[PDB]
Amino acid sequence: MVYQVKDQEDFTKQLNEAGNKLVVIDFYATWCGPCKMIAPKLEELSQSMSDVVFLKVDVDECEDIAQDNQIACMPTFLFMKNGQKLDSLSGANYDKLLELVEKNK
Amino acid sequence: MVYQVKDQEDFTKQLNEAGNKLVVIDFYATWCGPCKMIAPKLEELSQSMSDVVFLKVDVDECEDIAQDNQIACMPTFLFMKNGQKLDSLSGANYDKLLELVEKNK
């Protein structure tokens, strides 16, 4: 399950509800080709890894959140734990995504 | 001055208006930091070179144009001349941008 963040309020709530778990946030746009290519693999990963929280943020609807995290390349994956940034990944590199999840879980 | 493309029809109109000139199209988003840092450099370039036309497209307002040009990284520069795509540049690399202009103007 990859929950779609509705706004800044909702974003804070989900980070709290994550508890101590690694949070992976996917910043994407519906007009971006590599976003749509990686999205199914992220959804599959989230179904298996109940120990990691997966979130996604449509930058067209949450431009404020986008602005807050200095997005550039898309998709961008942000890794967070207890509300604190651990790492960042730009682009749809599934293997690098897996290493960062492995390192930071 | 750098003209903001309003829609797909307006984009064709601006490409026609450029005539034989090189056209540099900046795809950007208002929430993107690197886009804002380089926007003033582009305006200066736009003022100073009369053999190049500079356009910009807000990807949150023309999502159709961003999808049709496979934008992935903000900002992205597209270089066109006589309706033909010549080059692309991803990111706010001003020197590469300048080089690509000198090469294609």
Numbering used by the authors:
A (entry chain B), B (entry chain A): 1 to 105
What did the paper state?
Litopenaeus vannamei thioredoxin (LvTrx) is a redox protein with a molecular weight of 12 kDa, which catalyzes the reduction of the disulfide bond in different biological systems. The determination of the crystal structures of LvTrx under different redox conditions discloses a dimeric form mediated by a disulfide bond and other residues that are involved in the dimeric interface. The LvTrx contains four cysteines; two of them are engaged to form a catalytic disulfide bond (Cys32 and Cys35); Cys62 is not involved in any interactions, but in human thioredoxin (hTrx), it has been reported that Cys62 is readily S-nitrosylated, giving a SNO modification; and Cys73, which in previous studies, showed a dimeric behavior in the crystal system of hTrx and LvTrx, mediated by the interface disulfide bond through the Cys73 residue of each monomer. In an attempt to determine if the interface disulfide bond is viable to be reduced or if it is a consequence of a crystalline arrangement, we used X-rays as a tool to conduct experiments of radiation damage to monitor the reduction of the interface disulfide bond in two crystals of LvTrx.
During data collection, two crystal of LvTrx were diffracted at different transmissions, referred to below as LvTrx-1x (8% of transmission, 1.33 × 10 11 photons·s−1) and LvTrx-3x (27% of transmission, 4.14 × 1011 photons·s−1). In the case of the crystal of LvTrx-3x, the structure analysis showed that the catalytic disulfide bond was disrupted at a dose of 32 MGy. Despite the fact that cysteine mediated the interface disulfide bond, this residue exhibits a double conformation in the seven datasets. The disulfide bond was stable up to a dose of 85 MGy, in which the reduction was complete. The tolerance that the interface disulfide bond has to radiation damage is unusual, because this disulfide bond is exposed to the solvent with an ASA of ~50 Å2. This result suggests that the maintenance of this covalent interaction could depend on the residues involved in the dimer interface of the LvTrx. The analysis of our experiments with two crystals of LvTrx show a specific radiation damage in the catalytic and the interface disulfide bond as a result of the sequential increase in the absorbed dose during the collection of each dataset. This analysis shows that the catalytic disulfide bond deterioration is less tolerant to radiation damage than the disulfide bond located in the dimeric interface with a calculated absorbed dose of 32 MGy and 85 MGy, respectively. The disruption of the interface disulfide bond opens up the possibility that the dimeric form in LvTrx is also possible in solution.
